[PDB]
Amino acid sequence: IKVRENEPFDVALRRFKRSCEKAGVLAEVRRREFYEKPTTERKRAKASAVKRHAKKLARENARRT
Amino acid sequence: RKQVSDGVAHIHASFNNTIVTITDRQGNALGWATAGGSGFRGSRKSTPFAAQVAAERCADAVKEYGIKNLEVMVKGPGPGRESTIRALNAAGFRITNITDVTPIPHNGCRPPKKRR
Amino acid sequence: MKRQKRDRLERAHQRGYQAGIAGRSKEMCPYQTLNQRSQWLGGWREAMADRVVMA
Amino acid sequence: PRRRVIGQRKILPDPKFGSELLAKFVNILMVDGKKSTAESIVYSALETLAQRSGKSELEAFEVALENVRPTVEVKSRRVGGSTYQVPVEVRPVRRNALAMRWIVEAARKRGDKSMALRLANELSDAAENKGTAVKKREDVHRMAEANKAFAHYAWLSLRSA
Amino acid sequence: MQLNITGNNVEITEALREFVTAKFAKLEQYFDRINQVYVVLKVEKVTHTSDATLHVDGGELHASAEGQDMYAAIDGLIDKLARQLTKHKDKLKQH
RNA sequence: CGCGGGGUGGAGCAGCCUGGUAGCUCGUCUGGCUCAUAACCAGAAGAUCGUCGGUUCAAAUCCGGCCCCCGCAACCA
RNA sequence: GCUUGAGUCUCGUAGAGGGGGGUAGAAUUCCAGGUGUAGCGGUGAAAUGCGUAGAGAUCUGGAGGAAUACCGGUGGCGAAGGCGGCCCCCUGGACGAAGACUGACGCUCAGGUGCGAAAGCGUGGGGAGCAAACAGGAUUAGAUACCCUGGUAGUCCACGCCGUAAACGAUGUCGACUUGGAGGUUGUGCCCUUGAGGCGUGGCUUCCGGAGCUAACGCGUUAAGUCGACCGCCUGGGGAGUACGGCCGCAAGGUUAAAACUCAAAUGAAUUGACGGGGGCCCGCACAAGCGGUGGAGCAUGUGGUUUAAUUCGAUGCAACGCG
RNA sequence: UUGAGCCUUGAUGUGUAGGAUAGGUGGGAGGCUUUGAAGUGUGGACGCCAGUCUGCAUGGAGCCGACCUUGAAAUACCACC
């Protein structure tokens, strides 16, 4: 994004913030208007969020290991 | 040939190709080299190694302008984009700062529908 | 007819690496023991970077 | 196989010279299950490699071998529709055996009168960097070095030694 | 692609061999390069059945069809073979 | 009916805008690859440089003569 | 008469609720100019395409159109359809606290009227990007397709029409009652706001589960539980939401809506298998790494065919073909 | 800004052979220099990456020709180009 600093620099910070927000929004916006399935993909994503949270929570009983 | 001191290294880094345009501070071009023109063809253009060979074949043929230090702009979410700046640390340059000029619209025009 | 290859330790690595590259952003198909889950996830996170470097 | 880093057995060294590489070389051109006449071909060829080279025989064979041993070797892979070759580094056990297989095939070509004369001349041009197995060596290096742009995922040669 | 005809209790007449051969040739031309085809005709007191084994580059593929008059069984077998061929063909295209 | 330009692998042409060794894509031949054809990649031969002359050490390159083209004309017996 | 149902008033509260107007930034495209030169673009691979007439890239300027990244929240508002930059003007509804006021003014509603995504149609503008039709390149046995390169209606605005959608919560509206938990959002009361604190209280909403219900799946105080009021609709599958007739519409067509015939089924949910060009894990001469073969040749042996007086009979994918 | 033409000048012309980035032809042992020398403070061109031109010295009074290799002998010097 914007990295300038003193002599140990230039790679890790930049590939971090660059890679995350860059690859996110460009890999999203590169095609597929969709108009309809951000609704479905957010609904499935967040239903999977509550199912993963409750699933790990009630899966915190035992596993016989 | 102009005897320039510093330059600005734009790296267009699309999916199918990387082109590397080393310019000056002013914004007008001094020399460019692509990942297609370095012998790599078709699918082989779409590798980081062809971007590295592109940055080499630009970093010489900008020798005659005498650039000690350059900035790095990188546009495009491609498979190059990091090997091509390792290939500018290694090519004998002083990297001033690295930016990101990847165009993110505050969603405007409509993208294509492409895949099935 | 001989014995198992790299006894699930760095086979658990490459299962997590192949499963890391071919999507599966679950990180929820590992083993359950610690010494194999640790590097199923280790190969998974080593495969996310190898997904960023390519298409 | 899927399983089994296999319990490996070693070989007998060569009688006339203190070498197991040479005994492996006898086992390469040991066609049809017959070791003795292959030993006579190898000894009969290293003698005229000594007289047609001046230097000693074991160093003659080894210097003649290191000009055909490879470094990179292609592995054909397919993803989707493409089927490109990807350079893997050869492991140094496979290295010299892959050299000797090319020497022995290039000696089964080239046809002169006798097999010891064919293999003797083929090792001579392998010292001269001139014959057939150096052309196959340079073919392998040209196509692995030409396809050098592929270093990837997990199906080949994990981290280091 | 050479078609070999054989018959268990079914006397293979020359008009029977002409028709089967034509149908097989037509199918071979339409779907894939085929190397060899074995045809077996069985009659079991009621059921006119037919077997076919196609040897194609990928490998063997087989089908079987029971009918009423032998001709019907042959037609069923040929359609089944064509369906199997479509599966094998783009099973080894799969770009 | 005289001026110009071209004669170089099978073909298209660079070489010759300062004489010293024949070059690139295809077609054509291998090999790797592919289920086979393909596509990709890596190698190889492919010419006495249109024919005779001469100008110097040595000419595809410079100059005469001939043949074949392509244009410009002269084309009002 | 009465105030609990319903409604009004005084304070606030949040909100992509609606209509009109204006404006901002990023990006895409084009045009003019500069630098610069051999490729760009695209795919699973490619080619069509664009480029030595200077493209792609990079910089400066300008034009025009459209949509509003982040905030963005199983968050919010709306009767539903739906509504996301920011600001102004006009305007609807909901909610809560404390009172006052009217006094059953209420619920539902056939016909009717109104609103009603997208596509489409008419008139006039506008046209960046995308994109049916269409062209071309591929792919394929074929490929009027998916993939690629282009590209016109349309997408946008103003005014009319159409009146349908998987218009879905596949759940009519209104009201009452009936164990819990975890959250979201939005008000409000008290107390040590003394600390993002504690205890209650209303509204809207998300998930999980109790009895109960259900054919099961599942629903479960926002019910598909227990009841009440009113309306719409169903009576085997196909024919068929089709024909004829009416009504509406510029048309496309929408609504209302049969019958002859034909079948003994059609269906919903769940089960055990089998199957998948679904997934995960393990293994196999399955692939990879190699060695030697078969297919070319002569001959042996077996089989099919043909022949014959008979060429005895059987074995026929793997699992018949030097087999009995 | 910019071609084109014309003068006046000034650089450039490494095949092979090799002391060498020798252009041709002809003449040809005379000029260079203390009008403050080879090296380089220096700064470039060319650059067929090895050698030549000129800018300023702090040095300061020096160099080749015939005589070694070549179809060829020297921008040792000059003329015509």
From Swiss-Prot, chain A:
Ribonucleoprotein among keywords: yes
Assembly information from the UniProt record: Part of the 30S ribosomal subunit. In stalled ribosomes contacts ribosome rescue factor SmrB.
PROSITE patterns, sorted: RIBOSOMAL_S21
Annotated gene: rpsU
Biological role stated in the UniProt entry: Probbly involved in recognition of ribosome rescue factor SmrB in stalled/collided disomes; fusion of protein fragments to its N-terminus decreases ribosome rescue in the presence of SmrB.
Species for this entry: Escherichia coli (strain K12)
UniProt keyword terms in alphabetical order: Ribonucleoprotein, Ribosomal protein, RNA-binding, rRNA-binding
Database matches in Pfam families: Ribosomal_S21
Entry protein name: Small ribosomal subunit protein bS21
Family: Belongs to the bacterial ribosomal protein bS21 family.
GO biological process: cytoplasmic translation; ribosomal small subunit assembly
Swiss-Prot record, chain B:
Keyword match Ribosomal protein: yes
Pfam families: Ribosomal_S11
GO molecular function: small ribosomal subunit rRNA binding; structural constituent of ribosome
BP-aspect Gene Ontology terms: cytoplasmic translation; translation
GO cellular component entries: cytoplasm; cytosol; cytosolic small ribosomal subunit
Keywords of this entry: Methylation, Ribonucleoprotein, Ribosomal protein, RNA-binding, rRNA-binding
InterPro entries reported in the protein's UniProt record: Ribosomal_uS11, Ribosomal_uS11_bac-type, Ribosomal_uS11_CS, Ribosomal_uS11_sf
Function description: Located on the platform of the 30S subunit, it bridges several disparate RNA helices of the 16S rRNA. Forms part of the Shine-Dalgarno cleft in the 70S ribosome.
Other facts noted in the record for this chain: Has been predicted to contact the N-terminal domain of IF-3 based on footprint studies; exactly how IF-3 interacts with the 30S subunit is controversial.
Family: Belongs to the universal ribosomal protein uS11 family.
Subunit structure: Part of the 30S ribosomal subunit. Interacts with proteins uS7 and bS18. Cross-links to IF-3. In stalled ribosomes contacts ribosome rescue factor SmrB.
Record protein name field: Small ribosomal subunit protein uS11
Classification lineage: Bacteria, Pseudomonadati, Pseudomonadota, Gammaproteobacteria, Enterobacterales
Curated annotation (Swiss-Prot), chain C:
Keyword RNA-binding attributed: yes
InterPro entries: Ribosome_modulation_factor, RMF_sf
Subcellular location: Cytoplasm
Record Gene3D superfamilies: ribosome modulation factor like domain
Primary location recorded for the protein, binned into one broad class: cytoplasm
Keyword Kinase included in the entry's annotation: no
Example GO biological process: negative regulation of translation in response to stress
Single GO term (MF): ribosome binding
Pfam families, A to Z: RMF (PF04957)
Disruption phenotype: Non-essential gene, 100S ribosome dimers are not formed, decreased cell viability during stationary phase. A quadruple raiA-hpf-rmf-sra knockout strain is significantly outcompeted by wild-type after 4 days growth. Very high sensitivity to aminoglycoside antiobiotic gentamicin in stationary phase cultures.
Gene Ontology cellular-component terms listed: cytoplasm
Keywords of this entry: Cytoplasm, RNA-binding, rRNA-binding, Stress response, Translation regulation
Function: During stationary phase, converts 70S ribosomes to an immature dimeric form (90S ribosomes) which are converted to inactive 100S ribosomes (a process called ribosomal hibernation) by the hibernation promoting factor HPF. Inactivates ribosomes by covering the peptidyl transferase (PTase) center of the 23S rRNA and the entrance of peptide exit tunnel. However crystallization with T.thermophilus 70S ribosomes shows it binds near the 3'-end of the 16S rRNA near the anti-Shine-Dalgarno sequence, where it would sterically hinder translation initiation.
Family per similarity comment: Belongs to the ribosome modulation factor family.
Identification of the protein by name: Ribosome modulation factor
Curated annotation (Swiss-Prot), chain D:
Pfam families found in the cross-reference section: Ribosomal_S7
The keyword Ribosomal protein is assigned to this record: yes
PANTHER family in the cross-refs: RIBOSOMAL PROTEIN S7
GO biological process: cytoplasmic translation; negative regulation of translation; ribosomal small subunit assembly; translation
Entry keywords, A to Z: Ribonucleoprotein, Ribosomal protein, RNA-binding, rRNA-binding, tRNA-binding
Gene Ontology terms for molecular function: mRNA binding; rRNA binding; structural constituent of ribosome; tRNA binding
Organism: Escherichia coli (strain K12)
Note: The strain K12 sequence is shown.
Annotated function: One of the primary rRNA binding proteins, it binds directly to 16S rRNA where it nucleates assembly of the head domain of the 30S subunit. Is located at the subunit interface close to the decoding center, where it has been shown to contact mRNA. Has been shown to contact tRNA in both the P and E sites; it probably blocks exit of the E site tRNA. Protein S7 is also a translational repressor protein; it regulates the expression of the str operon members to different degrees by binding to its mRNA.
GO cellular component, one term: cytosolic small ribosomal subunit
Family matches, as SUPFAM superfamilies: Ribosomal protein S7 (SSF47973)
Transmembrane segments: none
Protein name from the UniProt record: Small ribosomal subunit protein uS7
Subunit record text: Part of the 30S ribosomal subunit. Contacts proteins S9 and S11. Cross-links to IF3 and the P and E site tRNAs.
Family: Belongs to the universal ribosomal protein uS7 family.
InterPro entries (UniProt xref): Ribosomal_uS7, Ribosomal_uS7_bac/org-type, Ribosomal_uS7_CS, Ribosomal_uS7_dom, Ribosomal_uS7_dom_sf
